[PDB]
Every structure is written in C-alpha cells, then in structure tokens.
Design an enzyme around this catalytic site. Structure first.
Site, PDB file in Angstrom:
ATOM      1  N   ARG A   1      13.612 -28.679   1.437  1.00  0.00           N
ATOM      2  CA  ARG A   1      14.249 -28.639   2.751  1.00  0.00           C
ATOM      3  C   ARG A   1      14.235 -30.010   3.431  1.00  0.00           C
ATOM      4  O   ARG A   1      15.202 -30.382   4.095  1.00  0.00           O
ATOM      5  CB  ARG A   1      13.561 -27.601   3.648  1.00  0.00           C
ATOM      6  CG  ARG A   1      14.260 -27.374   4.981  1.00  0.00           C
ATOM      7  CD  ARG A   1      13.537 -26.325   5.812  1.00  0.00           C
ATOM      8  NE  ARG A   1      14.254 -26.004   7.042  1.00  0.00           N
ATOM      9  CZ  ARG A   1      13.703 -25.979   8.252  1.00  0.00           C
ATOM     10  NH1 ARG A   1      12.415 -26.255   8.407  1.00  0.00           N
ATOM     11  NH2 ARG A   1      14.446 -25.688   9.312  1.00  0.00           N
TER      12      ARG A   1
ATOM     13  N   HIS B   1      17.550 -32.046   4.877  1.00  0.00           N
ATOM     14  CA  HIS B   1      17.668 -32.529   6.245  1.00  0.00           C
ATOM     15  C   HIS B   1      17.693 -34.051   6.314  1.00  0.00           C
ATOM     16  O   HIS B   1      18.051 -34.635   7.340  1.00  0.00           O
ATOM     17  CB  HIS B   1      16.546 -31.945   7.103  1.00  0.00           C
ATOM     18  CG  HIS B   1      16.825 -30.550   7.574  1.00  0.00           C
ATOM     19  ND1 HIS B   1      16.030 -29.892   8.486  1.00  0.00           N
ATOM     20  CD2 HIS B   1      17.818 -29.686   7.252  1.00  0.00           C
ATOM     21  CE1 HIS B   1      16.518 -28.684   8.709  1.00  0.00           C
ATOM     22  NE2 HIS B   1      17.603 -28.533   7.972  1.00  0.00           N
TER      23      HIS B   1
ATOM     24  N   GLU C   1      13.373 -38.060  14.056  1.00  0.00           N
ATOM     25  CA  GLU C   1      14.219 -36.909  13.781  1.00  0.00           C
ATOM     26  C   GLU C   1      13.353 -35.661  13.676  1.00  0.00           C
ATOM     27  O   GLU C   1      13.861 -34.538  13.632  1.00  0.00           O
ATOM     28  CB  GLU C   1      14.980 -37.114  12.473  1.00  0.00           C
ATOM     29  CG  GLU C   1      16.130 -38.086  12.577  1.00  0.00           C
ATOM     30  CD  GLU C   1      16.738 -38.409  11.226  1.00  0.00           C
ATOM     31  OE1 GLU C   1      16.741 -37.529  10.342  1.00  0.00           O
ATOM     32  OE2 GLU C   1      17.210 -39.547  11.049  1.00  0.00           O
TER      33      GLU C   1
ATOM     34  N   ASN D   1      14.108 -29.170  13.156  1.00  0.00           N
ATOM     35  CA  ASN D   1      12.987 -29.886  12.544  1.00  0.00           C
ATOM     36  C   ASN D   1      11.709 -29.632  13.331  1.00  0.00           C
ATOM     37  O   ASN D   1      10.661 -29.323  12.756  1.00  0.00           O
ATOM     38  CB  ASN D   1      13.246 -31.393  12.523  1.00  0.00           C
ATOM     39  CG  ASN D   1      14.121 -31.810  11.372  1.00  0.00           C
ATOM     40  OD1 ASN D   1      14.170 -31.131  10.345  1.00  0.00           O
ATOM     41  ND2 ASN D   1      14.826 -32.927  11.531  1.00  0.00           N
TER      42      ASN D   1
ATOM     43  N   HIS E   1      17.623 -20.777  -0.231  1.00  0.00           N
ATOM     44  CA  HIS E   1      16.919 -19.726   0.495  1.00  0.00           C
ATOM     45  C   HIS E   1      16.420 -18.679  -0.480  1.00  0.00           C
ATOM     46  O   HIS E   1      16.154 -17.538  -0.095  1.00  0.00           O
ATOM     47  CB  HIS E   1      17.838 -19.069   1.522  1.00  0.00           C
ATOM     48  CG  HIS E   1      18.060 -19.976   2.722  1.00  0.00           C
ATOM     49  ND1 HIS E   1      19.058 -19.747   3.655  1.00  0.00           N
ATOM     50  CD2 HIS E   1      17.373 -21.151   3.049  1.00  0.00           C
ATOM     51  CE1 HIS E   1      18.940 -20.751   4.546  1.00  0.00           C
ATOM     52  NE2 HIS E   1      18.005 -21.586   4.235  1.00  0.00           N
ATOM     53  N   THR E   2      16.319 -19.066  -1.750  1.00  0.00           N
ATOM     54  CA  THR E   2      15.814 -18.165  -2.770  1.00  0.00           C
ATOM     55  C   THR E   2      14.278 -18.180  -2.693  1.00  0.00           C
ATOM     56  O   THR E   2      13.604 -17.369  -3.311  1.00  0.00           O
ATOM     57  CB  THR E   2      16.301 -18.572  -4.169  1.00  0.00           C
ATOM     58  OG1 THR E   2      16.034 -17.503  -5.086  1.00  0.00           O
ATOM     59  CG2 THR E   2      15.620 -19.845  -4.631  1.00  0.00           C
TER      60      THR E   2
ATOM     61  N   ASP F   1      13.640 -14.671   0.710  1.00  0.00           N
ATOM     62  CA  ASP F   1      14.085 -13.806  -0.381  1.00  0.00           C
ATOM     63  C   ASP F   1      13.093 -12.662  -0.608  1.00  0.00           C
ATOM     64  O   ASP F   1      12.009 -12.869  -1.157  1.00  0.00           O
ATOM     65  CB  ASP F   1      14.235 -14.632  -1.662  1.00  0.00           C
ATOM     66  CG  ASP F   1      14.632 -13.789  -2.860  1.00  0.00           C
ATOM     67  OD1 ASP F   1      14.829 -12.566  -2.708  1.00  0.00           O
ATOM     68  OD2 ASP F   1      14.752 -14.357  -3.962  1.00  0.00           O
TER      69      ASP F   1
ATOM     70  N   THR G   1      12.051 -12.086  -4.875  1.00  0.00           N
ATOM     71  CA  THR G   1      11.102 -13.002  -5.515  1.00  0.00           C
ATOM     72  C   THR G   1      10.902 -14.128  -4.504  1.00  0.00           C
ATOM     73  O   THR G   1      11.480 -15.201  -4.625  1.00  0.00           O
ATOM     74  CB  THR G   1      11.658 -13.582  -6.838  1.00  0.00           C
ATOM     75  OG1 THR G   1      13.000 -14.035  -6.640  1.00  0.00           O
ATOM     76  CG2 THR G   1      11.646 -12.519  -7.939  1.00  0.00           C
TER      77      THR G   1
END
Ligand code: HEM
Ligand code: HEM
Ligand SMILES: O=C(NO)c1ccccc1
Ligand SMILES: O=C(NO)c1ccccc1
Ligand SMILES: [Ca+2]
Ligand SMILES: [Ca+2]
Ligand SMILES: [Ca+2]
Ligand SMILES: [Ca+2]
Lengths: 307, 307
Positions: free
Chosen positions: A39, A43, A65, A71, A171-172, A223, A226
């Site tokens: 991630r 970003h 940032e 964030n 997003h798994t 998820d 899993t």
C-alpha cells in the site's frame, strides 16, 4: 532513462535478498506488514510518481504526505522501511534509492504472501520534497463512484480498465477500519438504509464488527475468504456482493461496470490470468513519472533529504 | 555518576545553541512544538528514567513506547528531535546522547516560551530498548484522583507535593483533545451530568468546542488565558474552576487537596515562586534513574540502538 530490472545486478546484486529477509523476519511479529508495504508503494506512485516522497518526514520547508487524508492514522510500516534501507546501505553504500527499495519491497511482499514472483524495473531516484496537497487530491477515496475511480487512475496515466480492476486486487489481503464502511452499514447516501449492493448476511457480520457506537478504528479483513493470502479470492467476493468497501463492490455492481464485470469474472476464475494482469498493472504503476539519471538523489536516510 | 550541567562544556560547548536554533526555526511553522517537546521529556523520564527510551521505533525484539496509551496518536515532535540530533552529530560526533538532547530541548522549549532559563544537569546515556508495558502502567491518566496522581509521582521518586503541583504547571501551554474531557462535559462519573468542579460559563464554551457527536481529536487550549506563553496563569484558572482536565482541577478542588491548595495559591500569585519551584521539580524529574558512565550508549540515531 528507461527503468530496467537489471539496474543493480552489478552495483548491488543482493539487494533483493536483503529486502526479502527483512520482511520475512517482520512477518513473524506482524502478519499484516506485507499488505501495509504494498500500500505504501501505491500511495507513493500516485503522487508525483514513485519517488519515495511519501517517506519524507515533516520539515519547515514542506509538509509530509503522511498527514494526507488516506495516509494519516492509516499508512504504516515506516520503521520497517528504515530497517531494510540501513541493511542495504551497509552492503551497498549510497547505491539503492528509497524509491526503488519501496518498489522491490512491494513486489517481495506480494510474493511472500503467495502472489506472483517477478523482477521489477529499477533505476528510480528520490524526490527532494513531499507533496501533501497533491496527495490530498490524487489518492482515490472509498466513496468514489466507478467513473470517479476511473478518472483517478487515468489522471496518473493508468487509463486501462485492467489497471483499475487488477490493482484493486491488492485488497485480497490487509485490513480496513470500520470508519470507512459505516455508511454502507447504517446510512448509505443519506437514505438511512444500508448499501443495497452489500450481501445481507455479510451485513449482519459487519454490523457486529462495526457497531453504531463502537470503535471506528477497529479493523476488518479486506478479504473474508483468505485474509492474508495474496490470491484471486477478492474477485469471488465481489460476485457474491461481499466486497468490503464501496469502491470494491462498484467494480461489479456499478451501472458503469460494463467494461469491468468481464475482467472480474475472468480474474475470479483464473489465478494465472489475474496474476499476469496484476504484474503488468504493477509495472505500469511503477513507471509513473520516475526521477532518473541525475534527477533527484539517492537518499541515505529515507526520512530526510540529503544535506 | 552524578549528572552535571558542565558535562559538555569541553566536549560540545555549543550543543545548547544548536538545540535552541532548531526549536526557534520550528516554532515559526509550528507554535506548539515547544509544548510537545517538554511533554516528550516528561514521558521519557517517567518510564525507566530519562534514557530516551521513548524515542525508539518498533523492532522485532521490543515494542515502541510510542504505542502506549497516552502516547499513541498524542505524542509528537519526533522528526524535530531527529533534526537537532543530526546537527549535533555534525558538530560533535558520537558525543551527546539522545537522553541529554531531549532534556536540553525541554529546557530551551520552556525558556523560548517565556519561562525560566537554567542549566540542566547532563551526563545521561541512552537505553538499549523501549518499555511499552511499563509506560502503560507508569504514565498518569487524566481520570486519576488526587491520591492516584500522588501515587504515580511517588512511584518514580517525586514524593513531594511541590513536584506534582509545579510540574503540572506544564499545562500552562499546549493542547488537549476533546476526547479526554468529554466525560467532564456531558456525563461525569456515570452521573449523566457534567463535572460540578468545572465553571459553568466555561462549560458552555467547551461544549461548543467539543460537541457530543463532534470530532474527538479536535484540540483545545490547556490554558485559556495565555495558550502559548509559559507563565503562572495555569494556577489562576484552577482557582476559577477553569482547569481543563480532571487531573488539573483536582489540584485545587479535590477533598484531598489540603496540601496542594496552598501551593496553587502561592504559584498563582507569584511568578518567581512558581518558576523557582518548576526548575527545582524539573531537575528532580531529570534525575530519575539515569544511565551513566558505561551504562547504555550514545545513540547515533535516536530511533534505533547502535549496531
Ligand atoms: C481503487 C481505489 C482504492 C481505494 C479507494 C482504496 C481504499 C482503501 C481503504 C479505505 C483502505 C483501508 C484504510 C484503513 O483502514 O486505514 C485500504 C487498504 C489497503 N489497500 Fe486500498 N484502496 C484503493 C486501491 C488500492 C490499490 C491499487 C492497492 C495496491 C495494489 C491497495 C492496497 C491496499 C492494501 C494492501 C490495504 C491494507 C493495508 C494495511 O492493512 O495496512 N489499495 N485501501
Ligand atoms: C499530572 C498528570 C498529568 C496528566 C494526567 C496529563 C495529561 C495530559 C493530557 C490528557 C494531555 C493532552 C493529550 C492529547 O490531547 O493528545 C496532556 C498534554 C500536555 N501535557 Fe500533560 N499531563 C500530566 C502531567 C504533565 C507534566 C508533569 C508535564 C510536563 C511538565 C506535562 C506537559 C504537557 C504539555 C505541554 C501538553 C501539551 C502537549 C502538546 O500540545 O503537544 N503534562 N497532558
Ligand atoms: O487508501 C486510500 N486511497 O488509496 C484512502 C483511504 C481512506 C480515505 C481516503 C483514501
Ligand atoms: O499525558 C498522559 N500522561 O502523562 C496521558 C494522556 C492521555 C491518556 C493517558 C495518559
Ligand atoms: Ca510519490
Ligand atoms: Ca486473499
Ligand atoms: Ca524513558
Ligand atoms: Ca500560559
């Protein structure tokens, strides 16, 4: 200059192993770090390109940032990045940039989590400042509509539907705070009712995890199938209307999802197809306006610009 | 070994100026930094002594104190500490410890904010680890009763009433989040009514700043009279039942405040008396079980232990 996966094959041939070793050790105490690192890379790339601008700490000349909406109190793993940079600087002084380090770390994180394995193009250099205002405008929000998510990606050069659908597969694994789904659970779009695209049985489970007066910082698995394995289960969930956040489910349930539905169906039924597409999309993202040649620098400490 | 204010007079005679210069520059962009730094020193000293343990980042061998209740999403100014350490390491390599740096920074912060000026005893060294569980037990909470606040201070060696009353004067500047006073405003002690020791007119002002369904992270000034000046106004407020947090007002309104009331009255009417007492209490706090001689080390980077 064009990025190449062979950039450090002579100057620092073992940078990949040093990066992998650091994450392996960290995973032992923090199973979520792999997701957090991937991630951080995303970003980084979406704000002025993958230039490690997101790693800079606040200064009197510019704001970090890390304070950006999306964030702030959300992004994590910075000390871990510090650890691998130190280990690499020991083996290859002033050779590997933070921008490249974060890129390799993202790839290794995916692989270590069961995802595909590939060599990332390298040769990026580090920015001399951070871009907070740009981050506040460039990062996509979970309440964006499909067209808005498409605009956000096209804005940085990822103008293909596969880019959006494939990268969303991140997003798994990983977590999401209750605060970002409260509206889907109790009052969606000022209707006083939950999001109709959210599976009702799943809605009960989520409401149990994120109660009306509960802790908004409570974490939920992205998820449900899993939670920690990088696989294509993320897409199967979408087909069952079990995408966690609004931006997730819209890939399959939005009235503008004509072009994304086929990709979801495809990715949900073939790991190879998804992995191939994810690697391609990742390399495309890693190529967003990089600093090369003599541009930027090779930061010695990822938190600050070289004196 | 006994701490001495002359410890660096030969090895690094200009460390004080370098520290002052850094804060002066930062104050320009962040008027709250002086208060934040003084607080970092206090939270350092109360957990295993002033050994810079609070400055360590998370590792696989121990968790950071930055995650402690009271520190998490509250303590700040770390990058600023990084800046002065770098500047000092340039002028005096491997000479000044982070523990001492944080101590001088706290003193300069008070002076720069209009408070007293004095030379702090030096000679402390840095810890080799952080103590999260200890921090979670040693730091006083805003909901503590007077006797509980007294126990908390006595627990680390500050067994005098003047220590508690004088050091609490640190709330003469700085900010406090709405979340820590919500109970005093709307439902104190499960009574469904506000704290009776809080001035009613002031209660209206605070409720406006911290609404029932508002942002709990919204900040309020600790001292409503001179929010950024280090002076004795903090005590005048207590006499008017305008202490912001519970632990503040209890110094004057608690049934066990027999011994603290006189000190509050005294400090509220004489800046000299307060400043004298604050300096004495500060030096006592700075002397809590320090690491000296060959104990601990002189950290090169305050965030990590030396290799
Ligand atoms: C399509 C737009 C996207 C939106 C609106 C979005 C939104 C979010 C939100 C709301 C969270 C939870 C934040 C929190 O609870 O603190 C999150 C987490 C995460 N996202 Fe996304 N995201 C998007 C795209 C991506 C992409 C392209 C990747 C990378 C390939 C990614 C990887 C992750 C990961 C792995 C996590 C979990 C991080 C952790 O657990 O530390 N996201 N995202
Ligand atoms: C007697 C027990 C004490 C309690 C329960 C206490 C509690 C608090 C609380 C609740 C806050 C606000 C935190 C936030 O909103 O994030 C705070 C801030 C602060 N405290 Fe205390 N405190 C105590 C003692 C001290 C002492 C002895 C000093 C130092 C001499 C100190 C200096 C400060 C300063 C300057 C701030 C503002 C920090 C900033 O604005 O960044 N406190 N304290
Ligand atoms: O992850 C994000 N953007 O990619 C995000 C998260 C929450 C709020 C706004 C943006
Ligand atoms: O500042 C504190 N202790 O000194 C504190 C702040 C809030 C919650 C618990 C403790
Ligand atoms: Ca960037
Ligand atoms: Ca998965
Ligand atoms: Ca300490
Ligand atoms: Ca004041």
């Amino acid at each position: 200059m064009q990025l190449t996966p062979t950039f450090y094959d002579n100057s620092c041939p073992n940078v990949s192993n040093i990066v992998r070793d650091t994450i392996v050790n960290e995973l032992r105490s923090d199973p979520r770090i792999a997701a957090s690192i991937l991630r951080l890379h995303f970003h980084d790339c979406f704000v002025n390109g993958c230039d490690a601008s997101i790693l800079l700490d606040n200064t009197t000349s510019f704001r970090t940032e890390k304070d950006a909406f999306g964030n702030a109190n959300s992004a994590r793993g910075f000390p871990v990045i510090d650890r691998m940079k130190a280990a690499v600087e020991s083996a290859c002084p002033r050779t590997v940039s933070c921008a490249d380090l974060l890129t390799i770390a993202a790839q290794q994180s995916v692989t270590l989590a069961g995802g595909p394995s590939w060599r990332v193009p390298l040769g990026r250099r580090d920015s001399l400042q951070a871009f907070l205002d740009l981050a506040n405008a460039n990062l996509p929000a979970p309440f964006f509509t499909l067209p808005q998510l498409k605009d956000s990606f096209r804005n940085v050069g990822l103008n293909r539907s596969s880019d959006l659908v494939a990268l969303s597969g991140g997003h798994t694994f990983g977590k999401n705070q209750c605060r970002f789904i409260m509206d889907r659970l109790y009052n969606f779009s000022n209707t006083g009712l939950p999001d109709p695209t959210l599976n009702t049985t799943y809605l009960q489970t989520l409401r149990g995890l994120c109660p009306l007066n509960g802790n908004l910082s409570a974490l939920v698995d992205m998820d449900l199938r899993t939670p920690t394995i990088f696989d294509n289960k993320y897409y199967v969930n979408l087909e069952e209307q079990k995408g966690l956040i609004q931006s997730d489910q819209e890939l399959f349930s939005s009235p503008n999802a004509t072009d994304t539905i086929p990709l979801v169906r495809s990715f949900a039924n073939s790991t190879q197809t998804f992995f191939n597409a994810f690697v391609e999309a990742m390399d495309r993202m890693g190529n967003i306006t990089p600093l090369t040649g003599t541009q930027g620098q090779i930061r010695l400490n990822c938190r600050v610009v070289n004196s």
